[PDB]
A paper describes a structure:
Inteins are protein elements that remove themselves from their precursor proteins in an autocatalytic pathway called protein splicing. In the first step of the canonical class 1 inteins, the scissile peptide bond upstream of the intein rearranges in an N–S (or N–O) acyl shift involving the cysteine (or serine) side chain as the first amino acid of the intein (residue 1) and the upstream flanking amino acid of the N-extein (residue (–1)). The M86 mutant of the Ssp DnaB intein (here referred to as WT intein) was selected by sequential directed evolution for its more general activity and is one of the few known intein mutants with improved extein promiscuity.
The importance of steric demand was confirmed by the crystal structure of the M86 precursor intein with the G(–1)F mutation and revealed a constraint imposed around the scissile bond. The sterically demanding Phe side chain in the M86(G(–1)F) mutant is partially squeezed between the His73 imidazole side chain and the N-terminal scissile bond, pushing both moieties slightly apart. The distance between the imidazole ring of the histidine side chain and the amide nitrogen of Ala1 increased from 2.9 Å in the M86 structure (with the π-nitrogen as reference point) to 3.2 or 4.3 Å in the G(–1)F mutant (δ-carbon as reference point), for which two very similar His73 conformers can be observed, indicating increased mobility of this residue. This finding suggests that the polar interaction between the δ-nitrogen of the histidine and the scissile bond amide has been disrupted, at least partially, potentially resulting in a loss of the catalytic contribution of the histidine side chain in case of the M86(G(–1)F) mutant. Consistent with this interpretation is a re-orientation of the His73 imidazole ring, which is flipped in both conformers of the G(–1)F mutant, such that its δ-nitrogen is not facing the amide nitrogen anymore. Instead, the flipped imidazole ring of one of the His73 conformers is stabilized directly by the key Asp136 residue of the block F motif, which also displays a rotated side chain relative to the M86 structure and is within the H-bonding distance of 2.9 Å to the imidazole ring. The flipped orientation of the other His73 conformer in the G(–1)F mutant is assisted by a water molecule (water 145) that is not present in the M86 structure and establishes hydrogen bonds to both the Asp136 side chain and the imidazole moiety. Importantly, the G(–1)F mutation also leads to changes within the backbone geometry around the scissile peptide bond, which expresses itself in changes of the dihedral φ-, ψ- and ω-angles between the (–1) position and Ala1. In the M86(G(–1)F) mutant, the ω-angle (–173°) shows a comparable deviation from the perfect 180° as observed for the WT intein (174°), albeit with an inverted plane.
Author numbering:
A (entry chain A), B (entry chain A): -1 to 156
Write the structure that this text describes.
Amino acid sequence: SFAISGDSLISLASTGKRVPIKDLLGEKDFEIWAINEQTMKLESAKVSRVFCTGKKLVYTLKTRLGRTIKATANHRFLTIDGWKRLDELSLKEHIALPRKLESSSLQLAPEIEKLPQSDIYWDPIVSITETGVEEVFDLTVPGLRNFVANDIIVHASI
Amino acid sequence: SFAISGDSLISLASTGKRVPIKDLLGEKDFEIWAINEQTMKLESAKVSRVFCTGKKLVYTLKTRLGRTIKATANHRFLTIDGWKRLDELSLKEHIALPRKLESSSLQLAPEIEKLPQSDIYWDPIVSITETGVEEVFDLTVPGLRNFVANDIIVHASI
């Protein structure tokens, strides 16, 4: 059981807006953005449950591009070596952020043949800090089992 | 003196359309797209002259993404090792194409902090073939001394 702060902003694929995970408690059957680890591309994926795991100690993780999230010590992030717990990460280690690049011709027509292959931006960690006890939440994403929260790829429930 | 076929399509920065270089003969004071070799970014740049060098033997060069141009044997293209003549290139050698990537957030806001640094796509050569004698043209780009023709970075006159 791992989880994230209720303030964490979930990117919602149907609306193009974000909502904090706490505000989605008890909602379901909505789409988030997930990485497909086989293709390294982002796909929309359905949330089947959003739940609170109680009050837990959370830690703020920050990356070089300023992405930040508060998560439990056992919460997993995606490194080049696979999924790793927050309390196993070290500074300068890269974690996966989503990236959305579009490739156009000089005439502003689509030019997908020049698109970089992966939808991941690998960003180094610059801070990991114990922050305090908060109500924490997670969600279930059957199939791909990950989602974007605060513009970071995080693992869903197991 | 090197040159390209009159059919070669010049990307015009003000209009977002292309025109064959022959149709620009005698025109000037218009902007094309050029690579800045110091920053590796594309910039608009002014054409001061468009001229015909006569009838010359031209060669078709083609890359893996299907970019193709007809140019003289001494016409230069940009490799990772600098500018090289058509008659010095070999198959699988990469040459520079422009690329225009845009980086957006998952909410479709600009997200330039994740943009790849270079505006070049390095594409391998798949064919170099003597084609025939044609009227050929080039142009002068003071300062950056290159331009995009048939979606390939080519050197301007000297």
